[PDB]
């Protein structure tokens, strides 16, 4: 019996840690191994295999489990004979893909003949009840942060030092450079980590939502074990900038609006509606005299947003830099915005109160050997961890070669940290930089095109043991860049597409192909 934990942020990690605890207390044996240190090519020699997984940008497993997932899809997976399996999957209904990684894992493990002792079950953001009721049944049908006080639950109360836009005035996107002074708290981080920022909803948005429901704003509501006014709760503890299908169909059910009832039962229409309109506009389409308690039950708890750290403590000491791409969109001429990005962009004064913590990411790190070449693909707001990488390597005077791929719409407006990159290539820290400006000419050009153009040099670097890092969008960028890498590897390695995929999976296994995508 072995428990497999496939988690990036770590919500499945704690579930697997609790699971192994009562398995070792009750049965005996039971060993726990993450997907990153699992000898997955010896899967056929397993007795009992429990998989606890997560779901990234769209259905893909966590980056450490991508190798195992591709193994199960490679037609080279062995035929299972003496192992029983049970799959527990986490996820979030807000996103388009709800625990599809667990569904795929369960389906394949069944297809290769694994004994499904427990059927796969789905977990929402509130996984406490599901995990607690799942581990008991797992046990029944089976018996034949390093040291800092700060964490997600108790974030460090830091201060905002610098909030500077790093895009030109003629840029369609608003990208901020946020410098947060950690003070004397001694918070420690590494390049590749993420800064979980607790935010607060816009007071204007909260007021508009409250008056849109014909409420006052000071009526008491029940939050946790205390009583707080409605505005306080909607600003500090509830999410308003994200619309989910569940929120929409609950509004329809507790409202019976003629314009919302027909959409109930159609997952595609509900998801499109949720992704197209915010909560406040969705309730603007149909005010329904909803009381404070109904609003509180309808919404979801506010959660911190992770941002890749754009600085290294070897250079900035007690500061953390994050590159915040502000989400700004207009619905019927009313300018709406994202929660945390707009909170950091507008709603925090200089030296203001920002509650942050560190989300450690071990599977996105610079090579331990300073001489190892590094290839980075960071178009858009994915340039932050590579700025941290460059600062860390320049501080250590690492002699290794560095290759950066950056992409954005406009060169004169969307070149993030351009002067820093010019300085880095001036001093030889950044050996090569390749830029792809998609909106500078008639034809769209992205980073993957530059990877295709530089196939021979990329292949030589990979043969030199280089590390490939991808950070940025996951819906389109990550898949396109992975395809470009596969094409380059297949073309310049003298081998077909399947062998290219196997080579990329091997690179993932040797911690040489690492992604931080969102």
């Amino acid at each position: 019996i072995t428990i497999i934990s496939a988690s990036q942020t770590g919500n499945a990690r704690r579930v697997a840690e609790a699971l192994r605890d009562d398995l070792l207390a009750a049965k005996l044996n039971v060993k726990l191994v993450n997907a990153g240190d699992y000898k997955f090519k010896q899967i056929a020699s397993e007795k009992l295999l429990i998989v606890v997984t997560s779901t990234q940008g769209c259905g893909e497993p966590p980056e450490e489990a991508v190798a195992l997932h591709k193994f199960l899809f490679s037609k080279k997976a062995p035929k299972l004979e003496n192992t029983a399996f049970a799959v527990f999957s986490l996820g979030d209904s807000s996103y388009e893909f709800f625990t599809q990684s667990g569904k795929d894992f369960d389906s394949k493990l069944a297809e290769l003949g694994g004994e499904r002792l427990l059927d796969r079950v789905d977990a929402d953001v509130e996984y406490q009840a599901a995990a607690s009721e799942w581990r008991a049944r797992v046990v029944d049908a089976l018996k034949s942060i390093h040291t800092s006080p700060y964490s997600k639950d108790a974030p460090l109360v830091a201060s905002l030092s610098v909030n500077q836009k790093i895009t030109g005035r003629n840029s369609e996107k608003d990208v901020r450079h946020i410098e947060i002074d950690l003070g004397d708290s001694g918070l420690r981080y590494q390049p590749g980590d993420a800064l979980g920022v607790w935010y607060q909803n816009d007071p204007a948005l909260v007021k508009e939502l409250v008056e849109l429901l014909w409420l006052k704003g000071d009526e008491p509501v029940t939050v946790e074990g205390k009583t707080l006014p409605l505005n306080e709760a909607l600003q500090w503890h509830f999410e308003l900038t994200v619309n989910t299908a569940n929120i929409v169909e609950n509004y329809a059910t507790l409202t019976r609006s003629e314009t919302l009832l027909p959409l109930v039962g159609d997952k595609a229409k509900l998801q499109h509606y949720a992704a197209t309109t915010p909560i406040v506009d969705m309730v603007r389409f149909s005010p329904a005299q909803l009381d404070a308690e109904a609003l509180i039950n309808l919404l979801r708890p506010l959660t911190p947003r992770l941002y890749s750290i754009a600085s290294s403590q070897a250079e900035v000491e007690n500061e953390v830099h994050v590159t915040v791409g502000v989400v700004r969109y207009d619905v019927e001429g009313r300018a709406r915005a994202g929660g945390a990005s707009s909170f950091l962009a507008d709603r925090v004064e200089e030296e203001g109160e920002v509650r942050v913590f560190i989300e450690h990411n071990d599977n996105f790190r610079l090579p331990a050997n300073p001489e190892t070449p590094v290839i980075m693909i960071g178009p858009g707001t994915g340039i932050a961890p590579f700025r941290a990488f460059m600062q860390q390597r320049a501080a250590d005077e690492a002699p290794g070669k560095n290759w950066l791929f950056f992409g954005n719409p406009h060169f004169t407006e969307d070149f993030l940290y351009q002067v820093e990159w010019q300085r880095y290539v001036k001093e030889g820290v950044l050996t090569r930089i390749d830029l792809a400006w998609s909106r500078d000419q008639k034809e769209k050009v992205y980073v993957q095109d530059k990877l295709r153009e530089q196939g021979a040099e990329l292949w030589r670097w990979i043969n030199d043991g280089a590390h490939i890092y991808v950070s940025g969008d996951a819906c389109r960028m990550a898949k396109d860049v992975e395809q470009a890498l596969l094409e380059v590897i297949a073309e310049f390695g003298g081998m077909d597409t399947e062998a290219a995929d196997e080579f990329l999976s091997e690179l993932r296994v040797e911690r040489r192909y690492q992604r931080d995508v969102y």
Binding site: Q164, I166, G168, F411, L416, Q418, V419, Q422, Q441
Partner: protein, 570 residues
Amino acid sequence: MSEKHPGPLVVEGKLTDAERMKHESNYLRGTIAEDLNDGLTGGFKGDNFLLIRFHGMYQQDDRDIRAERAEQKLEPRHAMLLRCRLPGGVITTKQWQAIDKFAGENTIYGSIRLTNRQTFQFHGILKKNVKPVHQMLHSVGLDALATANDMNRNVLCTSNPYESQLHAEAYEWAKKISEHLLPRTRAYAEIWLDQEKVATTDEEPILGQTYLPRKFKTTVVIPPQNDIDLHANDMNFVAIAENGKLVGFNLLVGGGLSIEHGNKKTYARTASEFGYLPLEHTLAVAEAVVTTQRDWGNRTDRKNAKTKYTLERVGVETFKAEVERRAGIKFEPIRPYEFTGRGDRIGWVKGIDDNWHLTLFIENGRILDYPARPLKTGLLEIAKIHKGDFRITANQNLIIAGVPESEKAKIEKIAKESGLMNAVTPQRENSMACVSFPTCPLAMAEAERFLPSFIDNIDNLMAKHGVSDEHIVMRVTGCPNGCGRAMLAEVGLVGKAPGRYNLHLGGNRIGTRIPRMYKENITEPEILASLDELIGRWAKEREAGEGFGDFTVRAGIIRPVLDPARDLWD
């Protein structure tokens, strides 16, 4: 021997870095082709930053957003200024359509900036469009070679003589002079036009390996018009005609207006008369003068290299003797020439060829699509309809030349509807300014964006003083370089700091006298107060047909400059 000019023929000293850059550039090639292919920076690195000027482009950034981009972790918005080589200012309607299309499409500002040297300028050209602009210029038969850095500048010709029959010969000679003094190098064609390299070295028999010490500027003057301001440029060929045909030229050497604030060694002096040369000796004389300046220039000091400084150092007599020896000719005595004015002839002007010339007043020479004032679109429609060619004027104005009687009504209808020739006071027509902000790297004060409001105030002032029908040549520069030629106007405002200028008075209507500095480092309200007092004085106690500069000199409020090399600053 006069003690005024005791200096040697060639000054000895450490050569400037620019001369080294010219010497080691391998005949204007550099690494411009290689520098074009990098995307890390939007400009040209190394010596290419100055070598690209030899090909006609200036690397520039917007100074309105320079600090904002500096604090935005962004490099300055490096964009190129493409100045074309148009001898005499004559541009065909097909070429105008091409440049209009390029400015509308592949240029940040979307504007055609006419200059005072009878050519246009493209601002905000990205490095990726640096090659396509030269490609299209070659496609429509133009080029931008040797219009910046240290070669011959754009050659000027009077764009609208009263007897518009010598313009053909004068423009032909201006084009011949411009082509003669072009560099004989293949760098321009190899880099932009993509011509196969020849396995041999260049010669440059006209300019040499190191080229001229400074920029050289030439003009062709047809009296009595002086719109080209021949005293602001080195060589001037004052055309002389007998029986209605060109018979010779008058050579005036030693022009220049650039000064330095507080540097007595820099001055603005008027060109000195050399002599009359027969018509057939124009090219030889131009060659002799250019080569004499090349040999005797001050390559150790870049604020001492222009032909005026060489003239004042070696003496006019020795320079003339060397020019005569080099050209193998003798300078005949100067036949008399007179100047009536300096401005443009706005409106419809009848030509000898039964064609009408339409001079459009364009404010600051900026062609754009302003609200309810679509100058660019109207000009494009005119070019589509017109069958002649456009003549850019030295006053940053455009002349629609050779319009027949039948098409006169149509051209007037399209121009009037587009706001190209709407009502404008006479004072505004003789008011000019340099580009300055936000593009000029050396700009200290506002000239182009300050001229309209300033002239509005001045027009109101003249209306108050009842002299609104009269005009004063008023030129504002945001730089001591005098690019707007403020050092030849009746009232000149040379920039000193943002919002502060130096007021210069005592100029001339015909532009043959430098205006002496009156008050320095005074903001706009002080300038308007002083000019109000002086216009009120002028509007009463003036004579019949007296200009403002002549009145200021005569009234004793300012003293004229006689020899600018001695008493301009004193």
